[PDB]
Amino acid sequence: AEARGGLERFCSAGKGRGLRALRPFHVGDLLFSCPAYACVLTVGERGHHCECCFARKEGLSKCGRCKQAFYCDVECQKEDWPLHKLECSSMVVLGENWNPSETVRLTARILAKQKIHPERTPSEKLLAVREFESHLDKLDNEKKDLIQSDIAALHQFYSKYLEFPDHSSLVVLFAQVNCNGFTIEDEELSHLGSAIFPDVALMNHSCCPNVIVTYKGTLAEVRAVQEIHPGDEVFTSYIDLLYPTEDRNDRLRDSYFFTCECRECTTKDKDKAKVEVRKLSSPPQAEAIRDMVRYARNVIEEFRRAKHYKSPSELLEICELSQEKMSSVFEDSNVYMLHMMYQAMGVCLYMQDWEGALKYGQKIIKPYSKHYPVYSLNVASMWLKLGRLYMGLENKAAGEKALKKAIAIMEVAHGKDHPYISEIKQEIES
Numbered sequence: 001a002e003a004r005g006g007l008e009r010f011c012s013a014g015k016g017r018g019l020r021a022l023r024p025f026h027v028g029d030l031l032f033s034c035p036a037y038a039c040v041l042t043v044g045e046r047g048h049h050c051e052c053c054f055a056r057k058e059g060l061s062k063c064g065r066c067k068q069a070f071y072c073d074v075e076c077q078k079e080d081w082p083l084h085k086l087e088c089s090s091m092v093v094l095g096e097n098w099n100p101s102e103t104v105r106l107t108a109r110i111l112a113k114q115k116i117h118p119e120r121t122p123s124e125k126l127l128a129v130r131e132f133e134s135h136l137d138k139l140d141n142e143k144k145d146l147i148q149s150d151i152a153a154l155h156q157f158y159s160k161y162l163e164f165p166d167h168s169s170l171v172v173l174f175a176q177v178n179c180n181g182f183t184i185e186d187e188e189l190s191h192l193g194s195a196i197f198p199d200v201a202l203m204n205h206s207c208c209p210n211v212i213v214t215y216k217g218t219l220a221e222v223r224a225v226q227e228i229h230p231g232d233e234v235f236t237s238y239i240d241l242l243y244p245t246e247d248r249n250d251r252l253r254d255s256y257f258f259t260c261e262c263r264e265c266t267t268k269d270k271d272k273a274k275v276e277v278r279k280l281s282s283p284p285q286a287e288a289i290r291d292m293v294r295y296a297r298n299v300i301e302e303f304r305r306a307k308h309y310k311s312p313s314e315l316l317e318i319c320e321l322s323q324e325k326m327s328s329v330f331e332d333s334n335v336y337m338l339h340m341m342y343q344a345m346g347v348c349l350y351m352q353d354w355e356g357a358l359k360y361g362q363k364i365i366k367p368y369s370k371h372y373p374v375y376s377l378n379v380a381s382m383w384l385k386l387g388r389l390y391m392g393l394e395n396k397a398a399g400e401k402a403l404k405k406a407i408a409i410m411e412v413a414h415g416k417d418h419p420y421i422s423e424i425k426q427e428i429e430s
């Protein structure tokens with residue numbers, strides 16, 4: 001009997017361990033599904049999604065003690081209790097002074113899971129959490145310093161409720177979480193939480209992936225976006241594919257300690273249109289383009305480093321100011337311009353500026369369709385946000401066509417039967 005039908009763990013030369021197909025997979029086929037080994041709902045989604053299964057529901061039942069955890073019913077409340085009990089009493093005593101980061105909360109859950117279930121779980125048929133790479137020999141002082149900060153926050157918020165292995169074991173575990181952890185996003189790509197999917201973490205990266213990972217609650221699903229032939233390695237993308245090769249590889253080296261050698265990284269075919277420049281009387285020289293690219297990459301890094309504390313109004317002003325400055329060299333289709341429009345659209349949605357959000361979406365969609373792969377979650381989500389804006393602004397004709405473009409991608413990535421597709425189809429009917 002096969003551990004996972006038509007698939008196998010294997011050794012990928014120069015890429016450690018990986019996943020290979022044994023039988024052919026065609027576009028849209030489900031390779032495998034993997035239940036979360038551990039997961040945690042993001043703080044911002046408390047009250048809107050079930051803390052246990054991540055279901056989006058109205059009328060979730062709150063925990064009577066803390067009144068901070070919300071569930072579908074008592075069954076989801078009972079399932080989550082071994083994890084929620086580590087935080088319940090702490091959330092009552094300490095107010096909003098109880099603030100461990102998402103990584104610290106997820107790691108506390110892995111520690112609790114390892115204690116009760118030391119054997120391999122149904123989520124570890126190919127790769128177990130204990131086998132995860134950590135790359136501790138490669139970590140920079142900054143990443144080593146964040147691991148130590150996370151360990152101290154783990155003792156501070158969980159010492160009374162969890163028994164810890166030694167410090168070295170905690171350094172290994174937080175390093176494994178950084179290298180193998182996932183984030184779960186909804187149908188609009190909004191962040192829902194963090195999770196460990198050991199069998200999904202076995203797949204190596206490519207910027208030309210042959211699979212896409214989607215979520216059905218906290219169940220990860222892996223679907224083919226091209227033919228996967230017997231003997232082919234199964235590759236997913238670890239990062240956002242919008243960016244030029246250099247940006248992608250600096251991100252990959254920083255978080256995963258490797259340089260990608262996929263076809264896109266080798267040919268660099270899409271870089272020219274990704275860094276589109278405007279046709280001026282001049283036009284811009286290499287040095288002026290390099291200066292604006294360096295500037296944009298720094299704004300993106302700064303936006304990333306300050307995300308947690310900056311208000312949506314401060315986030316909007318930076319976007320508008322950066323877009324205005326870059327527009328002297330860059331075309332609107334340039335990825336750095338798209339970065340600011342996407343963030344700025346995000347703020348328009350937050351402040352219920354539906355018309356402002358739509359004007360941004362209208363400019364992002366065509367360049368997104370060109371820059372991303374043919375089957376892209378980013379492209380499907382953008383068509384979906386566009387469609388929802390149009391429907392809300394009474395443009396049923398434009399909304400329906402935009403929702404159908406989303407559905408066409410989602411049928412391949414999420415499967416034809418996904419609840420997201422059923423929800424979108426219901427929105428078309430009403």
Ligand SMILES: Nc1ncnc2c1ncn2[C@@H]1O[C@H](CSCC[C@H](N)C(=O)O)[C@@H](O)[C@H]1O
Pocket residue numbers: 014015016017018131132133179180201202203204205206255256257258259260261
């Ligand atoms: N395209 C690629 N080239 C080289 N190493 C890669 C890679 N994709 C992923 N990896 C490696 O795999 C790590 C993530 S976890 C993925 C499976 C890993 N090969 C293992 O043996 O456990 C990365 O940190 C990096 O070591």
Ligand SMILES: [Zn+2]
Pocket residue numbers: 050051052053054055071072073076
């Ligand atoms: Zn639930």
Ligand SMILES: [Zn+2]
Pocket residue numbers: 063064065066067068069084088089
């Ligand atoms: Zn509680």
Ligand SMILES: [Zn+2]
Pocket residue numbers: 206207208260261262263264265
């Ligand atoms: Zn690549």
